[PDB]
C-alpha cells in the first residue's frame, strides 16, 4: 500500500472543548486493490498515576471514544460492495467528530498525569490483515497536597433569626488508592434552632456509553453518619475515616461528600473531588 494517512484540515491546531475535528483519510495504491472498508477510531484518554510510598496506583479516564466507517462519494452503493482502487488516484475519505463539552482530561499532567488524543484509521482488505495508521492531535493544583473546604448556611427561626449551620473539612490529599482510608478532620457548627446531622460519603459518578449517549450514574459507596448536633453546640471529627472501596464505561469520577442534614431545610454540602486509582 503506497500511502495511508490521516490528514487533519488544520494540521497544526490545538482543538478546544465542543470543538469539531475534521479531516481526510487518504489512500493511494501501487496496483489495483479491492478494499472492504476504511474506518476510524478517535480517542482521548487521561491516565493519572503515582506511587503510594512504593505501591503502583493509577486511574484511567477516556473522554473521547468515537468510531465511524468512512465512505467515498463516488461509491454510492453501500458497505456490502467493495471498492476497487487503482494507481494514479487519491482516494479521500472525509471524517469529522465533535469533541465533548467540559473536561477534556487535561486536568492533571506532567508529574502525575498524561493525556492522549488520537485518530486511528483502519484499512480492511479481503484475505489481508487490517492495516492501521495513527495520528495524534492536540487538545487544550497538586494531586498530593492537602485539601481544605468550608461552607456556612443561614438557617433562621423567629427566635434565632441569624441561626447558622457550618462545616469546615480537611483531607490529606486528592489522590487515594483503592483500599485506602480517607481520614477526615471536620468541624461543624449549629447555632440554628434545629438538631442537625453530619454525614459523609464517597460517591462514584459513572460516565458510560449507553444507547446513542454518554449518560451518568451517581453511585454512593462507603458512608459515615456522625452524632446529631443539638442547637447551640459544635462537634468535631478527628481522623474519622471512610474506606475507599474497590468498584462501555468511559470514566468514573469520585468525590468525597461532607454534608449536614438540616430537617425542614436543604443540606449544607461540601463536594471534594478525588482521584481514585487501582
Amino acid at each position: 500500500i503506497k500511502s495511508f494517512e490521516v490528514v487533519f484540515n488544520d494540521p497544526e491546531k490545538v482543538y478546544g472543548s465542543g470543538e469539531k475535528v475534521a479531516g481526510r483519510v487518504i489512500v493511494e495504491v501501487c496496483e489495483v486493490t479491492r478494499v472492504k472498508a476504511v474506518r476510524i477510531l478517535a480517542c482521548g484518554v487521561a491516565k493519572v498515576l503515582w506511587m503510594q510510598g512504593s505501591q503502583q496506583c493509577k486511574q484511567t479516564s477516556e473522554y473521547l471514544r468515537y468510531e465511524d466507517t468512512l465512505l467515498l462519494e463516488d461509491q454510492p452503493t453501500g458497505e456490502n460492495e467493495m471498492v476497487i482502487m487503482r494507481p494514479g488516484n487519491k482516494y479521500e475519505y472525509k471524517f469529522g467528530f465533535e469533541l465533548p463539552q467540559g473536561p477534556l482530561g487535561t486536568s492533571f499532567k506532567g508529574k502525575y498525569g498524561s493525556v492522549d488524543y488520537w485518530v486511528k484509521a483502519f484499512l480492511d482488505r479481503p484475505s489481508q490483515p487490517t492495516q492501521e495508521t495513527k495520528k495524534n492531535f492536540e487538545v487544550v493544583p497538586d494531586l498530593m497536597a492537602p485539601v481544605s473546604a468550608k461552607k456556612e448556611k443561614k438557617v433562621s427561626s423567629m427566635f434565632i433569626p441569624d441561626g447558622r449551620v457550618s462545616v469546615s473539612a480537611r483531607i490529606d490529599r486528592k489522590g487515594f488508592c483503592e483500599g485506602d482510608e480517607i481520614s477526615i478532620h471536620a468541624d461543624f457548627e449549629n447555632t440554628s434552632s434545629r438538631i442537625v446531622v453530619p454525614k459523609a460519603a464517597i460517591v462514584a459518578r459513572h460516565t458510560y456509553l449507553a444507547n446513542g449517549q454518554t449518560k451518568v450514574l451517581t453511585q454512593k459507596l462507603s458512608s459515615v453518619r456522625g452524632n446529631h448536633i443539638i442547637s447551640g453546640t459544635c462537634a468535631s471529627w478527628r481522623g474519622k475515616s471512610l474506606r475507599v472501596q474497590k468498584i462501555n464505561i468511559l470514566r468514573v469520577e469520585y468525590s468525597l461528600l461532607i454534608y449536614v442534614s438540616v430537617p425542614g431545610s436543604k443540606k449544607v454540602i461540601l463536594d471534594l473531588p478525588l482521584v481514585i486509582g487501582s
Binding site: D187, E189, T191, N227, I229, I230, S231, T233, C234, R238
Partner: protein, 105 residues
C-alpha cells in the same frame, strides 16, 4: 476567676483542691461560635459564685481529658461534687448553666 487548664494531671490538681464543693468545667473550643458566646458568661458566673470552682478545658489542646470525660460536643459543662460527676449538659445555654449550678451546689 476561671482556671485555664492545660494538662491531664492538672485536671487532678483542681478536682483535689475542691472539698465538699461543686466544680464546673467548660469543655470548649476556640473555633466554636456557641462556646465563644458562652465564654464571658461563664467567667461572670465564676465571680458571682465564689463558693463554686470554675474550670476551662480546651477540647483541641487537652484531647486527652476530653476523651476521658467523653465530651462529644462544645460547649459541654460537667459538674462534680467531691470528685464524682453529679451533673452534665451540652449547649451555650446561660440560664441552664446558672440554673444547674444553683441546683447542684
Amino acid at each position: 476567676m476561671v482556671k485555664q487548664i492545660e494538662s491531664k494531671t492538672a485536671f487532678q490538681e483542681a478536682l483535689d483542691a475542691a472539698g465538699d464543693k461543686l466544680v464546673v468545667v467548660d469543655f470548649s473550643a476556640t473555633w466554636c461560635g456557641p462556646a465563644k458566646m458562652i465564654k464571658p458568661f461563664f467567667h461572670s458566673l465564676s465571680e458571682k459564685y465564689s463558693n463554686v470552682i470554675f474550670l476551662e478545658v480546651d477540647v483541641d489542646d487537652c484531647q486527652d481529658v476530653a476523651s476521658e470525660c467523653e465530651v462529644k460536643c462544645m460547649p459541654t459543662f460537667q459538674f462534680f461534687k467531691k470528685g464524682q460527676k453529679v451533673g452534665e449538659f451540652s449547649g451555650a445555654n446561660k440560664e441552664k448553666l446558672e440554673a444547674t449550678i444553683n441546683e447542684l451546689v
